[PDB]
Amino acid sequence: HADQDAYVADVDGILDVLRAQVLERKPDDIFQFISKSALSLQKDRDEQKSRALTIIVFGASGDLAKKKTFPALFDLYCGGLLPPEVNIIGYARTKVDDVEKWKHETLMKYFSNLSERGSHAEDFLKHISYFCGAYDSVDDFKRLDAVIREKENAFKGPEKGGNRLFYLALPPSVFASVCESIHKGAMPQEVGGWVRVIIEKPFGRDTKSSAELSQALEPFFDESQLYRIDHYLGKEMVQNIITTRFANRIFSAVWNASNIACVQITFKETIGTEGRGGYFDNIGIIRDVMQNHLTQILALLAMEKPRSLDAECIRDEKVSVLKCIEPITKENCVLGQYTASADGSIPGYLEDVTVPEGSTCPTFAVMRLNINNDRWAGVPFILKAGKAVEQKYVAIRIQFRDEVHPYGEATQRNELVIRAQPSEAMYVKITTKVPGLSGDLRQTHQTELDLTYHTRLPDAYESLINDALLGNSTNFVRKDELDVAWRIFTPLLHQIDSGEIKPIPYQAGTRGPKEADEFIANNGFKHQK
Amino acid sequence: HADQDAYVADVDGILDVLRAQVLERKPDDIFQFISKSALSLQKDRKDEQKSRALTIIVFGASGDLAKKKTFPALFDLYCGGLLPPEVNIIGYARTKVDDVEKWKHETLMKYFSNLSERGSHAEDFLKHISYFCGAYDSVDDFKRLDAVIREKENAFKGPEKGGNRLFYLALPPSVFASVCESIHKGAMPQEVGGWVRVIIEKPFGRDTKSSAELSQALEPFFDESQLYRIDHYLGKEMVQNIITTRFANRIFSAVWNASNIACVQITFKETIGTEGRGGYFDNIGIIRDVMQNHLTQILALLAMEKPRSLDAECIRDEKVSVLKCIEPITKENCVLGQYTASADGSIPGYLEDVTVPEGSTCPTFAVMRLNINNDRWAGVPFILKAGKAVEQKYVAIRIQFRDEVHPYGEATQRNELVIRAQPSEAMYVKITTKVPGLSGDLRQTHQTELDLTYHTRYDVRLPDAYESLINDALLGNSTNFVRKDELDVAWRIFTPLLHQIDSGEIKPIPYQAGTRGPKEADEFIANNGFKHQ
Ligand SMILES: NC(=O)C1=CN([C@@H]2O[C@H](COP(=O)(O)OP(=O)(O)OC[C@H]3O[C@@H](n4cnc5c(N)ncnc54)[C@H](OP(=O)(O)O)[C@@H]3O)[C@@H](O)[C@H]2O)C=CC1
Ligand SMILES: NC(=O)C1=CN([C@@H]2O[C@H](COP(=O)(O)OP(=O)(O)OC[C@H]3O[C@@H](n4cnc5c(N)ncnc54)[C@H](OP(=O)(O)O)[C@@H]3O)[C@@H](O)[C@H]2O)C=CC1
């Protein structure tokens, strides 16, 4: 045969994936971990149809729309999470003389798993049309409204009107123009239907510019209609944070300063900005992922118990705890900027032709936040994010206060870890006895206890779009929430923009600046064993 | 000549194994069984106690406990490398034995386990065993025993002189005081060096007065660093599960109290009945048999305050302190049962035993509530349950945590912590977690069990509770042994109830063997803080 080279190739394929999984979890029980992971790798081997639904994607010619938004709508479609009569309209200034060719040669190529999904892509494209128009024309939005109304009137069922989800896959400088135009020309039919508007980051760049944008949108849409989306906040992580704590006496009781020594929230990527460091260059890693994404995780982790599990009680508590956070100081922040990797594989951040010469834009930051309330006073909250570092990894790590007595050096800090990348996991680390008579009471082991552990759908982005269709605003930042968050970070961001602290170089592929790990060790973190 | 002795040795070695296998596996064709085994056997093929001589003296060596449990446990420690290389084991009993080597190779070896693979080890082990036919109340015999022990102590290949002496009383308790007086008078360790430890078998009395009288009888001869009152059922693995999982860890240390725990149940369940020995059981009852001793020690370890160190006596100090916070159990806090024949007829009733007095009201089942009146536990019901001839074999601790009513409401329930010893070891929490992805909104949850145990690389076939206890005595660790003050406090918790029972004031409810027990018992548990899952 030549299939012998294919059987060997597959075998070596399963075994290398198993190798990487075992080497990540590092269980002492290698045999049973190998056993289950092979069994699991073989595994991988009417409320809402009641009304017409129209999705309008502004900026549909752009990078985000064709590479992420339309493919996510495709995945929701194939998962049967869109109603069967959904109509999707792309809206953009770009002339398109031939709409069917645009759908097939531009949009369809970025659809995922086109092999297995035979005939589903062409079915989905039937739900898509294109409107070439201006974002700031009231008349064009009246014309768009006539087109939407024709699609809503085709709905076969008895519910009148139609729901409209507007998706602003556009620079934020166009947001207020689009929302005014919708308000004046294309609100839902009076006979029935909601309007919801998905807004993309950046939501301003400091307290004053973000407040200006919110003030510009609020004449047109209220906080039950605006959905400020954070692509990275998956439903699974949020449920792990809320349910594992608040449904359980054991975890609820220790979620406080009497029991917790340190909290770290960490967002790491091996990729750099190598492609287009240029438009990262005026944002930097703090605005990019930490004032928005890591701070929402922080709010969900640190909030008081909400009055119910309803969306706005949860957002109420996110706002309440964020208000207890002192503005971060320049003394509590260490910045990095990555250079070329030791092996030359990854060029340095400045070696990008789209990055201005002499840029001091930070690609790495670690900072300490202080939450000054009864539950959290004195507990270090460390946020860390970095581009081009040693691994792809996103996790929460809670370190509990050590029980010095009576085990002494035979014990150490308990931990609770909630990981989103490279795979979902949630586990605790505690001291246990060692089985067998070889060990007296002082012979212990630091043991990991997995609540969940996945190998490396709908994804997080798709779950948020689905959340907006279902009217669930939990994972979206509210207007008041956003202002408080910007007030935590803006004094620091101003100090950085004045050069008061400056990034330390680090080679792509390392952990980052050595000073960042020194800062972490100085702010209450302790390494296991 | 060397090979002639080596050959006969090997032959006798195979023969001893075969005889043991036939005597134990009781085949009706002896000839066929010997042949199948013989061919199969062909196919089958610390520095501190290396330092001084060790002598283990087993009194009552002729008896049932000695041959069936104590010597085989000693064999298992020998194979696990847990006895010093030149250890000397002396069986001491009144029974005349005209042929000691026959006793060692036919009577003792019959009960050694896994002779298939350990037969040559069994022969090595028996070279360490001698037999002393003697009286327990003889000054002169104990002088003679001391001379035997000293001769072999004094030949020891090692740095320190003298020798450590471990005495095991595999005897009725009525003999303890006399044999202890004899040891103290004539067979204490040489003054030049060595400790003495004495393992005492149960029962330790049968109420406060009788138990105190026995302790008062023993204390002129051995202090509490010398007496080891053994409970065979309290294994090292459960005790470390109780102590380490809590006190080494912030997470469990912080919820181990009445602000967090709604109720605690400690349960000892057997499917077997009294198995034709109902007369022996009839004068003991289930409370004295397993509850005042075994379950109460588990309770003390679960409920105690943090010990000042992990030293054995610091732990025993805390066991004593928490037991002193418990009022004597009253009959309104107790439900008793006595088992009748199983519905299928496979288990005869307790009263159908011919050795059981007619009209006996002896309890074979009991559930009771104990209150620990202190800051950590005030208001927390502690339920002890023990039963013969019930629906399953099961020994566990179950801790129910106070429910988190808000915000999940009926989408959550009480967390639980379970520590299980039988029929297999386990330790886990039951908690409420999200249900994967999909429709599942925040309020869609399920209960899952989070294992709390360390999973080692190879399957650890760790020894039984009994052998770990003998090892602990050999190493000088009294943690799992009941101390004299602890014993008295425990009897005072239970004796007023045992008096009420012996006065007829509470009379067992019948229940068929194989059921859970009297239905009044499950009602009692439901009325005292437990909630079904
Ligand atoms: N993966 C991604 O692409 C990322 C997306 N984002 C955010 O998502 C949103 C869209 O991202 P992306 O597609 O990359 O952005 P683009 O800058 O590529 O804009 C998308 C579309 O918007 C129109 N557009 C661009 N500039 C203007 C302008 N001044 N006035 C009117 N229309 C304009 C263009 O379509 P036309 O000319 O046809 O009208 C363009 O094709 C932005 O808010 C962005 O900050 C942030 C992080 C990464
Ligand atoms: N598996 C078991 O058998 C269990 C027993 N125990 C306890 O262990 C101890 C011994 O158990 P077990 O072997 O069954 O008891 P036995 O009644 O069988 O006595 C053990 C030995 O002690 C001697 N003996 C018996 N009665 C007397 C007496 N009045 N005076 C002097 N010697 C006597 C006998 O040896 P000799 O005549 O040769 O001197 C006997 O063989 C007891 O305290 C028992 O309650 C606890 C756990 C389980």
Numbering used by the authors:
A (entry chain A): 7 to 51, 65 to 475, 480 to 552
B (entry chain B): 7 to 51, 64 to 551
Give the authors' words.
The housekeeping enzyme glucose 6-phosphate dehydrogenase (G6PD) (EC 1.1.1.49) is the first and rate-limiting enzyme of the PPP. It catalyzes the oxidation of glucose 6-phosphate (G6P) originating from glycolysis to 6-phospho-D-glucono-1,5-lactone (6PL), whereby the cofactor NADP+ is reduced to NADPH.
In contrast, the LdG6PD wt and the LdG6PDC138S mutant, complexed with NADP(H), G6P, or both substrates, adopt C121 space group symmetry with one dimer in the AU (AB). Comparing the LdG6PDC138S structures to the wt structures revealed no major conformational changes (RMSD = 0.4 Å with 1056 residues). Although the KM of G6P increased by about 20%, indicating a lower affinity, the activity Vmax increased to the same extent so that catalytic efficiency remained stable.
